[PDB]
Design a binder for these strands. Structure first.
Ligand SMILES: [Mg+2]
Ligand SMILES: [Mg+2]
Ligand SMILES: [Mg+2]
Ligand SMILES: [Mg+2]
Ligand SMILES: [Mg+2]
Ligand SMILES: [Mg+2]
Ligand SMILES: [Mg+2]
Ligand SMILES: [Mg+2]
Ligand SMILES: [Mg+2]
Ligand SMILES: [Mg+2]
Ligand SMILES: [Mg+2]
Ligand SMILES: [Mg+2]
Ligand SMILES: [Mg+2]
Ligand SMILES: [Mg+2]
Ligand SMILES: [Mg+2]
Ligand SMILES: [Mg+2]
Ligand SMILES: [Mg+2]
Ligand SMILES: [Mg+2]
Ligand SMILES: [Mg+2]
Ligand SMILES: [Mg+2]
Ligand SMILES: [Mg+2]
Ligand SMILES: [Mg+2]
Ligand SMILES: [Mg+2]
Ligand SMILES: [Mg+2]
Ligand SMILES: [Mg+2]
Ligand SMILES: [Mg+2]
Ligand SMILES: [Mg+2]
Ligand SMILES: [Mg+2]
Ligand SMILES: [Mg+2]
Ligand SMILES: [Mg+2]
Ligand SMILES: [Mg+2]
Ligand SMILES: [Mg+2]
Ligand SMILES: [Mg+2]
Ligand SMILES: [Mg+2]
Ligand SMILES: [Mg+2]
Ligand SMILES: [Mg+2]
Ligand SMILES: [Mg+2]
Ligand SMILES: [Mg+2]
Ligand SMILES: [Mg+2]
Ligand SMILES: [Mg+2]
Ligand SMILES: [Mg+2]
Ligand SMILES: [Mg+2]
Ligand SMILES: [Mg+2]
Ligand SMILES: [Mg+2]
Ligand SMILES: [Mg+2]
Ligand SMILES: [Mg+2]
Ligand SMILES: [Mg+2]
Ligand SMILES: [Mg+2]
Ligand SMILES: [Mg+2]
Ligand SMILES: [Mg+2]
Ligand SMILES: [Mg+2]
Ligand SMILES: [Mg+2]
Ligand SMILES: [Mg+2]
Ligand SMILES: [Mg+2]
Ligand SMILES: [Mg+2]
Ligand SMILES: [Mg+2]
Ligand SMILES: [Mg+2]
Ligand SMILES: [Mg+2]
Ligand SMILES: [Mg+2]
Ligand SMILES: [Mg+2]
Ligand SMILES: [Mg+2]
Ligand SMILES: [Mg+2]
Ligand SMILES: [Mg+2]
Lengths: 147, 122, 257
RNA sequence: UGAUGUUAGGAGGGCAAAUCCGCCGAAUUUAAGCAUAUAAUUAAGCGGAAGAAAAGAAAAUAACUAUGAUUCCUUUAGUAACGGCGAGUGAACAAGGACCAGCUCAAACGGUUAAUCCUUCGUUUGGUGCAAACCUUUCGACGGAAUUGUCGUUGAAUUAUUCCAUGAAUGCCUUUAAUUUGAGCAAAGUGAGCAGGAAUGCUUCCCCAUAGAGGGUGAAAGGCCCAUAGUUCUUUUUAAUUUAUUCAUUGGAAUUUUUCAUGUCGAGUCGUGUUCUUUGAGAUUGGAGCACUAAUACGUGUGAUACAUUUCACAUAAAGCUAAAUAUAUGUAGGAGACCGAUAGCAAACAAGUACCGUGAGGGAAAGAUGAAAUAGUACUCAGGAAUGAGCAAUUAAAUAGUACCUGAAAUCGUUAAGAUGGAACGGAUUAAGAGAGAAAACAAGUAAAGAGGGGAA
RNA sequence: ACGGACCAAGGAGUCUAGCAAAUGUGCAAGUGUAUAUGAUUCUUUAAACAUUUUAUACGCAUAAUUAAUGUAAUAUGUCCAUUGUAGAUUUGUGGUGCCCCACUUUGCAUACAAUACCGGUAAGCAA
RNA sequence: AUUUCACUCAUAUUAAAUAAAAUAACUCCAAGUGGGCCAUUUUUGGUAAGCAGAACUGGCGAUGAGGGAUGCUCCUAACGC
RNA sequence: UUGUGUUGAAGCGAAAUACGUGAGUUUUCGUGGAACAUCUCCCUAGUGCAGAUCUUGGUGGAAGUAGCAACUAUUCAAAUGAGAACUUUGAAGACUGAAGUGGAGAAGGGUUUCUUGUCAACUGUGAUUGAACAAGAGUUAGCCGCUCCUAAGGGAUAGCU
RNA sequence: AGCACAGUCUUAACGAUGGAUGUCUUGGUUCCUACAGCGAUGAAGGCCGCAGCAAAAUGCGAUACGCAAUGAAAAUUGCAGUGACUGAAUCAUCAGAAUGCUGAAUGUAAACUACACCAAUUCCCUGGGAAUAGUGGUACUCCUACAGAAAA
């Protein structure tokens, strides 16, 4: 709103806040990203170090649908179940759940966290990591590969 | 209008339409009210004012006087009554313009045209 | 917005220095007293406006759905406190209860005179009087832009189905209508003020528990909507301060300088 | 075969452009200079159409459990890529929606008979018109075009079920619902009192509302006038619902059972080399000029890094037509706004692209308001050659509202009064002498008597 | 040293895109109902209301690192939540006036360090 | 080196004095500025200069009041009525 | 939200035993003749002028000042008229001096021509004058010209680009 | 009957000049919706005319500020005039009739109201009469048909 703008405070003063000696002229240092590498070098170097130069290989027609792959850690693996259904698997020791993470939008199971001791679980997925697969085998479960 | 969006309620438009109305629309705008007695004999409430009618002046400096209509001025939106007059600075006599909505007409002058209208209105 | 080139349709240019005049552009030619005048520049008569207005100024806003629902809910609650309705300017001194529910015969009244009689018998005579006397001709240029009058807001009748209420309660100065399943914050809080006087029909009053999920029903209840909670349990601070437990922990009053 | 023909019948030409289609083609500017780059496949120039135009029924994606003509919206994404790798530039597939539609020629096949087409002159039916005029509808003749190729089929037969078109007379056209045009009707005070030139104001006594939108009327009107809510009739066309009975041919089509035949598929084109442009396109994305110049479906083309020998997938180039979803600084009509209010808003609220300027291409203003009513615009007298002034005289509520007419600021000037005044004037501080104006704190509650009023209780 | 003979009206940090910091509001491992569609929405309303009758449109966030094929956060002895110094709050005794001290108990935020693990690179060994 | 445990080193006058010492420490987002000159004392080039170039403090710039008749920089002294 | 107004709004001129440190707010009298606020809390912007050789419009001192100087030169009497140095008549004194302010044409102008009337502005002093203003008139061809012929040249047709 | 020096500057009151301020608005501006070309059967633009008294703008075309027809329907008015007493005075609609010279402009030309060739042309009555130098046609390119000639 024009009501609360800073310029209304300087309405009686001469220079409108820009100074007697160094005026407000138009483009006194260039246009856009003009002077970098010559006289804007310090700003570029201390705020954006690796800006100049090129590195790596070209990929001419990418098609990102080929490598789409959302992930889930083993932390969040028992939390997908409702609490009441999470509850009965604790008492009963003869039955385990079978979880299909690809029905929830996850593709690769990844292995950060801690599973509950002696509480087996069976997991379906397209990809697994080594640590995740070991941690699932340790509490008495099994990993199944799908497509 | 009130509910139909196809006609206007703009002051500009229908205030321009009042002051440039064609001469065939100017007689419907120039309408007066019927007396109580004429409202039983005829089922209408108001009629456009014609020449040889008789009227009672109900509003203005000449309220209460009666008489006969002697002329209609469609350009100025005014009527003229038979003995309501004025003197100019010369001393010549003229008629005082009366607005038809300031008036109630107490005796009509019927003819072939009027009948086929009052019949429809009743 | 203004016309796109208003002020700049001329082949003017400046005379330069020398000639003992300022350096603005000027109209060329001769034979008319428009020739030789300053043409464009915001300080010149007939010149261009400073920052000509444009149609791509952002006219509207988008508001979070949850906040809109919160505001509507907190606005209905303010309709049930007697002191707030009084402080919005409604003349309800003679009313019995402020939530003010009415039987369902209201929904099928058919004549304006009957509606005025219903309002008068309920005790709202000096509320229908405030509205009639309140019509005035506005001050300012809004008269020349189709804004002739200015009236005050009256009661807001809320119904579930219309069997005459719509036509019956129109034409009364200041009275407005609304249906329970389509409620508008712009009517419930006119100008941003809180405490609108409302009149509920019985079915309108009962639908209000099915809409908000106390009783569930298909295609009527708001899907997965939870009614907001307060960060305070009981806002009566001075009843807490005067409790025996609190008073036993206070410390002797001290002296000023 | 060409010229010729005031032979008979017809077509093109110019204007207008906001949206659309084709060509031609800059520089200003940015890079803090500048030449590649950018500005820009833009401005100016030249051509061609419609209510939309253009595009369009795969020589397309993908690499999956696969999708399926074009267009446009949301996203992919400021991403893959291009770049004195600087400044800067920059698409495609999948996903969610709007809409939804498919077809023709060329090439195969038809020769006990071009089946095809056009001009001119005739005739034969039913409906609609007051009239003008129009619609529908078979059957002839003479002449010409065409085998240097019109028309039919969409490989051709056989077998069963079923569907479609065409001819007659005795009847049958009711009822209802929605879209459209133009008309008719449409409630309730012109009651007291005050003040006013005049109520639409104030006080008070009534009322209408499915109508308290807007305008008009001597001052602010739900009940004074037009209209407004509503409703009746009318024209347009389009959905249901209401009857078809009897008989009589001739030709078509879809699928099914078996029989035999694997035919055709767009060339100085595609492609390659080379030169210039253009693109995000990179040992070259599309286009163009020149030189060379293919194959025959097992062939040809695409699968984003240049080669050789191969596998796999997808498609079927070099001919054509086609609604809808999209756009619209133009023309014409309708509606509206937290927009401007006569130095503002379009240049133009007025005899405005006007008056006027330039040899010409062109340039281009200023300027709204008496009063309710002039159907009240200034009668009469005196002075003066006249303009004009004055009145014992005159319109109006008002003329210091008299047409250069609402209100009527400042700069600048006139008149009267009061002050000051030895080579500037005005100022700050502090008092004094004059002059104008003033009682709300700048004294007096209450008490007694009489006179006029206004209220509250019982 | 430059502008200013006088008076009236006009006359200059704004709008849009994109990013960040600060602050207010809502919900919270989620959050934002896109384009559309629906409705007994239709003077106002171009507003407001709704969401498809163990629930895969898209953006940002929830995971990093490498040119890249790719790989991907203590580890199953215990649902436990790495280690130390200072430190807010709490627990139990005593001192001087609920406060401050001397011990005792617990140990937020954060500062300084240590350790373990993930991606890339060296070194050693390598089917 | 580190980790534990036991013992013990002034403090109420504070391991020397003095202290309108916490008006402290740190993080974030931004403005203006980047032509200076002068005085006492030290000091370079120049015959010198109201000339040119440096050092430590205090000023003028950005600042008025009393005094030096007068004066941007000298002396006293810095500013609500 | 809740208020003022034909028993007089906004605006303007002069003011006040008035309030505030201040920007300002409030009130009296006069003029004026039709609309005007909200400070209860919010929204919004083309929102505050001493200057820019600033834009448009109006107005000063200079100032009754500079100036109204080429072309030899005027006088007496009368008429008209409200009013005659510069309208008309008569008498004088003079100039142009046939290479003429004498006659007739072209380019250019367009009614300035004629008769009558006549003075608001113009005719840089006056003006009864006038090319100014108003009403009405006036241009006659077989023989004067154009129209015809061709010139330096222009535009076209066939063809070509 | 008499008395104030003159000039310059300051204040008040009443005026002159000028057109600010307030109020007003048949105008602008933006958005939304709907429809959409015209021309040899002569367009857009240009010029010349038309009224009782008639300059501009507006409207019309030798029938010329308007004809006929259809819907309303008494006046139009500055004077003079015309009007039922309802095809008539006026308003609206607009389908019939009529529509000057030009202009792509198209017989040849163009600072010309200049000059060709071909058919004489139009009207009234039902074969007769009458009038008028008046009317129509003639660009270029192209397609279908036709006509004969000429070349092979
Ligand atoms: Mg400052
Ligand atoms: Mg400056
Ligand atoms: Mg000068
Ligand atoms: Mg303008
Ligand atoms: Mg105002
Ligand atoms: Mg042509
Ligand atoms: Mg053309
Ligand atoms: Mg440059
Ligand atoms: Mg530059
Ligand atoms: Mg340069
Ligand atoms: Mg162009
Ligand atoms: Mg067209
Ligand atoms: Mg098309
Ligand atoms: Mg096409
Ligand atoms: Mg897209
Ligand atoms: Mg390139
Ligand atoms: Mg580009
Ligand atoms: Mg799609
Ligand atoms: Mg064939
Ligand atoms: Mg009065
Ligand atoms: Mg009045
Ligand atoms: Mg009204
Ligand atoms: Mg009404
Ligand atoms: Mg092919
Ligand atoms: Mg390029
Ligand atoms: Mg691909
Ligand atoms: Mg094709
Ligand atoms: Mg408008
Ligand atoms: Mg203007
Ligand atoms: Mg007035
Ligand atoms: Mg002297
Ligand atoms: Mg200078
Ligand atoms: Mg000067
Ligand atoms: Mg934030
Ligand atoms: Mg992104
Ligand atoms: Mg590993
Ligand atoms: Mg081995
Ligand atoms: Mg500098
Ligand atoms: Mg000092
Ligand atoms: Mg001295
Ligand atoms: Mg005001
Ligand atoms: Mg401004
Ligand atoms: Mg101003
Ligand atoms: Mg000024
Ligand atoms: Mg001057
Ligand atoms: Mg002199
Ligand atoms: Mg003279
Ligand atoms: Mg001589
Ligand atoms: Mg001589
Ligand atoms: Mg001589
Ligand atoms: Mg003459
Ligand atoms: Mg004369
Ligand atoms: Mg003179
Ligand atoms: Mg003349
Ligand atoms: Mg002649
Ligand atoms: Mg001759
Ligand atoms: Mg020649
Ligand atoms: Mg004196
Ligand atoms: Mg008839
Ligand atoms: Mg008629
Ligand atoms: Mg013609
Ligand atoms: Mg010709
Ligand atoms: Mg000639």
């Amino acid at each position: 709103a024009t009501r609360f703008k800073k310029n209304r405070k300087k309405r009686g003063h001469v220079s409108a806040g820009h100074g007697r000696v160094g005026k407000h002229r138009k483009h006194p240092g260039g246009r856009g990203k003009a002077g970098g590498l010559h006289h804007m070098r310090i700003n570029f170097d201390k705020y954006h170090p690796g800006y100049f130069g090129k590195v790596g290989m070209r990929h001419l027609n990418l098609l990102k649908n080929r490598t789409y792959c959302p992930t889930i850690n083993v932390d969040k693996l028992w939390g997908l179940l409702p609490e009441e259904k999470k509850k009965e698997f604790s008492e009963n020791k003869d039955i385990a759940p079978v979880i299909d993470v690809t029905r929830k939008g996850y593709f690769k199971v990844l292995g950060n966290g801690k599973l509950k001791h002696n509480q087996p679980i069976v997991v379906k997925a397209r990809y697994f990591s080594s640590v995740a697969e070991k941690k699932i085998k340790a509490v008495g479960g099994q990993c199944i590969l799908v497509a | 209008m009130k509910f139909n969006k196809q006609k206007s309620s703009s002051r500009r438009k229908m205030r321009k339409a009042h002051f440039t109305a064609p001469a065939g629309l100017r007689r419907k705008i120039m309408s007066s009210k019927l007396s109580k007695e004429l409202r039983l004999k005829y089922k209408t409430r108001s009629l456009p004012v014609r020449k040889d009618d008789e009227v009672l002046i109900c509003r203005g400096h000449n309220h209460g006087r009666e008489g006969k209509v002697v002329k209609i001025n469609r350009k100025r939106y005014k009527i003229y009554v038979e003995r309501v007059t004025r003197e100019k600075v010369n001393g010549e006599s003229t008629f005082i313009g009366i607005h038809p909505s300031n008036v109630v007409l107490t005796k009509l002058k019927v003819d072939k045209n009027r009948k086929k209208i009052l019949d429809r209105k009743a | 917005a203004v016309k796109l080139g208003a002020g700049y349709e001329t082949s003017a240019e400046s005379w330069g220095t020398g000639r003992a005049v300022a350096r603005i552009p000027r109209v060329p030619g001769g034979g008319t007293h428009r020739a030789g005048q300053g043409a464009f520049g915001n300080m010149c008569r007939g010149g261009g406006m400073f920052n000509p207005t444009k149609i791509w100024r952002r006219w509207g806003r988008k508001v979070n759905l949850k906040e809109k629902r919160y505001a509507v809910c907190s606005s209905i609650a303010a309709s049930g406190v007697t002191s707030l309705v009084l402080a919005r300017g409604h003349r309800i001194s003679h009313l019995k209860e402020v939530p003010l529910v009415v039987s369902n015969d209201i929904e099928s009244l058919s004549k304006t005179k009957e509606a005025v009689n219903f309002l008068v018998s309920l005790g709202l005579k000096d509320e229908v009087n405030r509205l009639v006397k309140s019509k005035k001709i506005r001050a300012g240029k809004g008269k020349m832009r189709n804004r002739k009058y200015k009236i005050r807001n009256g009661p807001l009748i809320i119904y579930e189905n219309d069997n005459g209420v719509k036509k019956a309660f129109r034409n009364i100065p200041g009275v407005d209508l609304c249906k329970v399943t389509k409620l508008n914050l712009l009517k419930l809080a006119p100008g941003g003020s809180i405490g609108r006087l409302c009149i509920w029909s019985e079915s309108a009053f009962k639908k209000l528990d099915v809409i908000y999920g106390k009783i569930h029903e298909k295609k009527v209840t708001k899907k997965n909507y939870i009614l907001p909670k307060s960060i305070v349990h009981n806002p009566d601070i001075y009843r807490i301060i005067h409790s025996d437990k609190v008073q036993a922990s206070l410390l002797a009053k001290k002296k000023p300088c």
